[PDB]
Amino acid sequence: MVSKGEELFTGVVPILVELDGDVNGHKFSVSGEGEGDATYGKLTLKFICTTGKLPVPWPTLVTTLVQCFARYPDHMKQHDFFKSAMPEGYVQERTIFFKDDGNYKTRAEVKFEGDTLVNRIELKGIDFKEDGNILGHKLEYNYISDNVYITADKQKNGIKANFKIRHNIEDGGVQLADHYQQNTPIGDGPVLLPDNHYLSTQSALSKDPNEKRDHMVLLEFVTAAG
Ligand SMILES: [Cl-]
Numbered sequence: 001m002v003s004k005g006e007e008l009f010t011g012v013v014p015i016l017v018e019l020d021g022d023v024n025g026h027k028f029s030v031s032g033e034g035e036g037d038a039t040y041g042k043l044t045l046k047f048i049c050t051t052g053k054l055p056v057p058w059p060t061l062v063t064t065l066v067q068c069f070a071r072y073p074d075h076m077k078q079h080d081f082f083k084s085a086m087p088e089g090y091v092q093e094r095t096i097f098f099k100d101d102g103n104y105k106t107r108a109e110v111k112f113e114g115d116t117l118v119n120r121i122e123l124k125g126i127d128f129k130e131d132g133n134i135l136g137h138k139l140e141y142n143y144i145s146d147n148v149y150i151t152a153d154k155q156k157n158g159i160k161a162n163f164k165i166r167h168n169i170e171d172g173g174v175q176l177a178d179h180y181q182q183n184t185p186i187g188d189g190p191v192l193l194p195d196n197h198y199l200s201t202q203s204a205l206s207k208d209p210n211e212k213r214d215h216m217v218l219l220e221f222v223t224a225a226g
Contacts, residue, residue, distance in 0.1 A: 026055035
C-alpha cells in the first residue's frame, strides 16, 4: 500500500522557504524558492535576504532552511517519518549551539500549501559575541556535509535527531555547531516511527553572478542509510 504522503513526492515538487530571524537583536528575513526530487534525494534552491545584508553567515542557516525530500531506499521506506506526515505536515524544532559562542532556537512548520512544499521558520539567536565567528562573518562559504542521526520519540509520536556541523573558519580553524532536533506531526493521522538510522547529507553553496541582493544558491543531496 502506498501512502498519500509518499505519492506526493514521486515527481519534482516546488519548494518555498520563508524565514524570520532575530539574532542578538538583529532582525532579518530570508525567502527561498526551488525544486525537490525525492526519488534522487535532490534539492536545488536559491535564497535571498529580503531585508538587506544577512547579519549571520549563510552557511550557519543551511540546516534551518525539508528532510521530506530525502531519498529513502525502498528497504527503508517504513522508516520515513517525514513523508508519512504529509500533506498536513510536521513541526521541526531545533537548538543549535555554536561552540564558544551563542545559540539558535528554531521552530518550523513543513507542509503542503496546494502543490507547493512550504518550510516556514522562526529563528531566535542569543548570546553571540559581536566580534565572534558568526556576527563577524568569519566562516568559509563552499560546502556543508554531515550525517544526521535519527531516533524515534514514541511519547511525541515523532522523531529526534542530533548531529554536528563543522564550519571552516576562513583564516584557519573550525567552528562547531551542535544540533538538537525534534519533529512532531501536525495532524492526528498515522505516521511512521523509525528504527535508528541516519541521513547522509551533502550541500554545495554558490553565487548567482547577476544577483545584487545578498543570497545563496544551494545544491543538496540527502540519502537515508542504515
Ligand atoms: Cl556568508
